[PDB]
């Protein structure tokens, strides 16, 4: 949909020769596609959610020992064997106390004990498994320029076919947006997502869900059972046995471990859980759709220019990125018409800067029209209108160009420098550059990047500091082979980003 209210925004300029451009989507980021001679569009990812989940194994957190029993054996070799040893719901352990004449034995030595307790649980960490053929990722596509009544919503925006919705199912990976008179746009995105499914579980604890790893979930020491029925099989991890003084023992639990579990698995992607459908929202992965802009045509091109004057509403305000936003309205009867928009450095000067909207066409009597403009760094005037009565608001946009380049470099090294292979996938560049980058990064990610794990932020900083110390205090010019391993970009990644 509209990408004005967000700050993480990507502007792709499109290729004149081609008709397609590869884009990468996140749940927060957005990209504005704007070619020449075509209406500019926005594509946004809404959500990712699986539907059907398979149970794996529910653990236990709280022990509820209820019944106890005991049986003692004299130093005569016949030891005690509790008859409650033979019930699957009873935890029982045999120990040897020190029996004597006071207890009523008759010989001095070491006796025997067998105390069984009834096991019960009240808090369980139910797991689940996600299938890679059930997620239904939905995205939205919008077109700039259309203008309707002031009191309109997304329902009427969809009705006019300017905010067409998409449902990229696991089976229908290619879909088309109707977009009304503007044509039709289809997508080519794959099934390569940031979350590596068939390798993770969801660890529901008390209504808080997670995306924890399969082997780590398998290697927890806790009393587990089967999902079909709570039939515990490792009961001894939550029940401790006190000292066996004489013919009697006492049993104690070990707390709840809920805090310890929430601390250990305290940094995994906290996915949500939408009830009434058993859906879970991933909020983490990506989607690399390929827009094929072949049937993208302007809606109004035979309309005449708008002659009379507009009325200004929502006086121009700057956006977090730095693009102006206006909302002009038309009140006269020479409609439909195409609104003229210009951006000059002086009233009555040459055109400078970039205009975002493509063709602000009207189609009715009283319509509000949102206009976005990206002015240059210096002083400039934003002129809307045709005749002697034109909106002539001007803007400064106090900022430097070298600062803009530095911010662009920083946001690049933050965003695109991540994702591994996906780093050089923002577009198509000739000269074998991107192809060789992907070819080398395939093995670069196969080995030395994802072959081992167990690294946190404090370990990152400690090992990094060890690295600079050993590199500064190094001989034989090992920095030449170390710059590829750890350099400046990776140091920035360890320090500022990935936090």
């Amino acid at each position: 949909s509209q990408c004005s209210g967000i700050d993480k925004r990507d502007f792709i300029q499109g290729v004149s020769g081609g008709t397609w451009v590869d884009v990468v989507l996140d749940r927060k980021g957005c990209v504005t596609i704007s070619a020449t001679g075509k209406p500019t569009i926005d594509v946004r990812m809404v959500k990712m959610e699986a539907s059907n989940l398979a149970s794996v194994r529910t653990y236990c957190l709280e022990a509820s020992t209820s019944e106890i029993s005991s049986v003692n054996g004299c130093p005569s070799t016949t030891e005690a064997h509790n008859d409650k040893r033979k019930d699957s719901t009873y935890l029982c352990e045999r120990s040897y106390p020190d029996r004597g004449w006071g207890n009523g034995c008759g010989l001095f030595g070491r006796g025997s004990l067998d105390t069984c307790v009834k096991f019960a649980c009240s808090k369980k960490m139910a797991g689940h498994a996600i299938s890679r053929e059930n997620i239904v990722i939905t995205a939205a596509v919008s077109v700039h320029g259309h203008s309707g009544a002031e009191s309109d919503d997304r329902s009427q925006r969809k009705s006019r076919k300017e905010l067409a919705e998409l449902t990229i199912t696991f089976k229908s990976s290619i879909v088309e947006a109707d977009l009304g008179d503007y044509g039709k746009v289809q997508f080519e995105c794959l099934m390569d997502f940031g979350i590596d499914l068939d390798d993770v579980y969801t660890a529901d604890m008390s209504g808080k869900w997670w995306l924890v790893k399969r082997d780590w979930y398998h290697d927890i020491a806790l009393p587990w059972t089967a999902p079909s029925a709570d039939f515990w099989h490792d009961m001894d991890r939550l029940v401790e046995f006190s000292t066996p003084h004489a013919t009697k023992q006492s049993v104690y639990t070990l707390g709840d471990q809920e805090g310890a579990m929430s601390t250990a698995l305290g940094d995994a992607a906290v996915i949500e859980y939408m009830s009434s459908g058993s859906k879970v929202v991933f909020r983490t992965g990506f989607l690399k759709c390929r827009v094929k802009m072949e049937n993208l045509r302007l809606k109004g091109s035979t309309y005449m220019q708008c002659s009379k004057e507009f009325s200004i509403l929502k006086r121009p305000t700057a956006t977090p990125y730095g693009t102006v936003i206006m909302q002009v309205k038309y009140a006269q009867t020479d409609v439909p018409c195409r609104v003229p928009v210009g951006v000059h450095e002086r009233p009555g000067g040459e055109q400078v800067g970039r205009i975002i909207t493509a063709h602000p066409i009207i189609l009715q009597q009283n319509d509000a029209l949102v206009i976005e403009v990206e002015p240059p760094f210096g002083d400039s005037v934003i002129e809307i209108g045709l005749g002697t009565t034109k909106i002539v608001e001007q803007w400064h946009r106090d900022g430097s160009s070298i600062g803009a380049a530095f911010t662009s470099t920083m946001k690049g090294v933050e965003r695109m420098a991540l994702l591994g292979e996906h780093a050089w996938d923002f577009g198509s560049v000739g000269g074998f550059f991107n192809s060789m980058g992907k070819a080398i990064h395939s093995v670069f990610g196969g080995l030395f990047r994802a072959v081992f794990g167990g690294m946190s932020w404090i370990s990152k900083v400690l090992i990094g500091a060890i690295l600079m110390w050993l590199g500064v205090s190094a001989r034989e010019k090992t920095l030449a082979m170390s710059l590829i391993t750890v350099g400046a970009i990776l140091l920035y990644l360890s320090t500022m980003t990935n936090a």
């Binding site: 979350i195 601390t263 250990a264 698995l265 995994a268 909020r283 983490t284 932020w457 404090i458 370990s459």
Partner: protein
Amino acid sequence: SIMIPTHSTGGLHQGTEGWHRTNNVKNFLMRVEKWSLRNPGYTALIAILGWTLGTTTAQKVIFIALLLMIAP
């Protein structure tokens, strides 16, 4: 967790944070320095060992840092 690093090895960090997730970086250092100031004998022993071994004043810093980190 206290010896094995946390579960941040999954590469699933994003721009979403909770109420009480960013305080651990300073909390660990505060706990370590509190322990060091409360128990001076262990730190003195580690410093003596680091001075005895190496005698370079470049890797003994790493050794004492590792010993103080593994020490609760």
